[PDB]
């Protein structure tokens, strides 16, 4: 079973930033780049960028270029995420799902997400 | 970026019938004869679900009443016969080209008595 363990729900003030994570287990870490999706209120999905573990590599929605920030940290298979500037807008549920590219191309395992409040 | 368009948004279906989610495709999403279409499904409270990868892969543990066809900008998503647990909203996404995106969601809803 692969589990995705993200960090708890965040209540931030607007022009702050919060800086999420999301464990991995049961699978080698870095043999999978990690995804992240905005599921707003109430509404579709929306992917932010994706992040190769093993060197670091990242790449991103444009829509989401400056807001947020792909880290990762192999020692403790952890994949974080930081959101800066946050606004009104940026509240919502926010998923980090593994996708396997040498595998079969699918983004397999989802976290259970992490409610961030803007206000 | 390629986008993807789910018609209808909202769809009811009788207990046992067919139910046909269709996902249109800005751009080709063919690369050597495989469709990089991908099907999920979320129930409310929940993160989303994979039911078929590369348009047409049952992923394990999916119920055989889903079936996914397709290739190159038009694909569809049915579920046949349609049961009560298939309530839930249905998204395709395609990883041909970066972004990746998905498209805007079907929600599905069952008609009983």
């Known amino acids: 079973e692969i589990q995705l363990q993200q960090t708890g729900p965040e209540l931030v003030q607007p022009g702050a930033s919060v800086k999420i994570s999301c464990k991995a287990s049961g699978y080698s870490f870095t043999d999978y780049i990690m995804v992240w999706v905005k599921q707003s209120h109430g509404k579709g999905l929306e992917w932010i960028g994706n992040?190769?573990?093993?060197?670091?590599?990242?790449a991103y929605n444009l829509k989401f270029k400056g807001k947020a920030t792909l880290t990762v940290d192999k020692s403790s298979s952890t994949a974080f995420m930081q959101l800066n500037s946050l606004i009104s807008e940026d509240s919502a549920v926010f998923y980090c799902?593994?996708?396997?590219?040498?595998?079969?191309?699918?983004?397999?395992?989802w976290g259970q997400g992490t409610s961030v409040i803007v206000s | 970026d390629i986008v993807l368009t789910q018609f209808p948004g909202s769809l009811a279906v009788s207990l046992g019938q067919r139910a046909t989610i269709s996902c249109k495709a800005s751009?080709?999403?063919?690369?050597?004869?495989?469709?990089?279409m991908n099907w999920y499904q979320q129930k409310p409270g929940q993160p989303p679900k994979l039911l078929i990868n590369?348009?047409?892969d049952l992923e394990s543990g999916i119920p055989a009443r889903f079936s996914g066809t397709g290739s190159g900008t038009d694909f569809t998503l049915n579920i046949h016969p349609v049961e009560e647990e298939d309530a839930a909203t249905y998204y395709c996404?395609?990883?041909?080209?970066?972004?990746?995106?998905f498209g805007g969601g079907t929600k599905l809803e069952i008609k009983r008595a």
């Open positions: 590369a348009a047409s």
């Open positions: 996404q395609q990883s041909n080209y970066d972004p990746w995106t």
């Open positions: 751009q080709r999403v063919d690369y050597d004869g495989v469709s990089y």
């Open positions: 799902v593994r996708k396997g590219y040498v595998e079969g191309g699918g983004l397999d395992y």
């Open positions: 992040i190769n573990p093993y060197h670091g590599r990242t």
